[PDB]
Amino acid sequence: GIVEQCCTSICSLYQLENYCN
Amino acid sequence: GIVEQCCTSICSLYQLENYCN
Amino acid sequence: GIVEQCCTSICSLYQLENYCN
Amino acid sequence: GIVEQCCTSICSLYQLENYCN
Amino acid sequence: GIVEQCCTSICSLYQLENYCN
Amino acid sequence: GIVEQCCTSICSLYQLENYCN
Amino acid sequence: FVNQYLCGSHLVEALYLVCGERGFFYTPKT
Amino acid sequence: VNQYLCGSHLVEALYLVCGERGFFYTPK
Amino acid sequence: VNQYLCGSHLVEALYLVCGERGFFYTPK
Amino acid sequence: FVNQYLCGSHLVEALYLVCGERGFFYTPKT
Amino acid sequence: FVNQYLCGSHLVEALYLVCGERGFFYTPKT
Amino acid sequence: VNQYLCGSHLVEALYLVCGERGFFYTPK
Ligand SMILES: [Cl-]
Ligand SMILES: [Zn+2]
Ligand SMILES: [Zn+2]
DSSP states (O other): OHHHHHTSSOOOHHHHGGGBO | OHHHHHTSSOOOHHHHGGGBO | OHHHHHTTSOOOHHHHTTSBO | OHHHHHTTSOOOHHHHTTSBO | OHHHHHTSSOOOHHHHGGGBO | OHHHHHTTSOOOHHHHTTSBO | OOOSOOOHHHHHHHHHHHHGGGOEEEOOOO | OOHHHHHHHHHHHHHHHHGGGOEEEOOO | OOHHHHHHHHHHHHHHHHGGGOEEEOOO | OOOSOOOHHHHHHHHHHHHGGGOEEEOOOO | OOOSOOOHHHHHHHHHHHHGGGOEEEOOOO | OOHHHHHHHHHHHHHHHHGGGOEEEOOO
8 A cells, every 4th residue: 555655654755666567 | 715715614616706706 | 646637737636636645 | 817927937035925915 | 954954853945055056 | 976876767675775874 | 526525725626627608606605 | 939838837936936915817 | 868866756755646545566 | 766755746756756657556554 | 925835845946936046955864 | 938927836845855955946
């Protein structure tokens, strides 16, 4: 879950790259 | 009041269209 | 795609809604 | 209007303040 | 401190101009 | 500067990181 | 359309997007 | 040139400098 | 014309009108 | 990269920036 | 000018707008 | 081309990738 990982928890560059295509 | 309708309360597409000209 | 349609001419919410999931 | 003035050349806060209420 | 002056406290136009170059 | 490089062609995070402190 | 609290410049940009060429008014004051 | 992209920045720039006064936005 | 600047507004405009449905963004 | 809570259109624009020409997916639902 | 809490990228864009061609510095750290 | 529109995205893109380091923005 993206909101869950980055909005209500904090997430590093490597964690936002999991949402790339 | 716009702040009142959409910032401290939530407002649907039809409610933001009331602020169009 | 949406870039070649909505970057040249402008799209509305309704053309824009074609790209949603 | 403000589009034809502030989209070509750049406007400052003071030119920009002309459009306020 | 900028965050300190404008994010957790409020700051007027004259206070943001201190951060200009 | 960064304007003449990142406004013409696109820059990545890594070219972009050159401008950080 | 999203189901969220729209404030500051997020609310204005939502307006800009949904009013299109009609344009809009923004009068935040109490 | 490209009013739709320009418009979106303008309206953000008016929201900052008009504040409590608000504004009208009419592309005409 | 300038897809990178245009892209950034598009994606904001999809986030508003898709809401809970979300979207995919593929520049191709 | 910043160390903060990214939400609404801030999180999407971060995605847009870090995925580059790959593009990305945004599925906010629970 | 607005009377509000300016944070994250909202504070930077306010800077960008009010410093004009002078440009500005952004040093958020404690 | 259009530095004022471009500038506004740049500065947002530096705020994300510089984080705690911050940056200087000089259009020159
Ligand atoms: Cl733009
Ligand atoms: Zn733009
Ligand atoms: Zn925001």
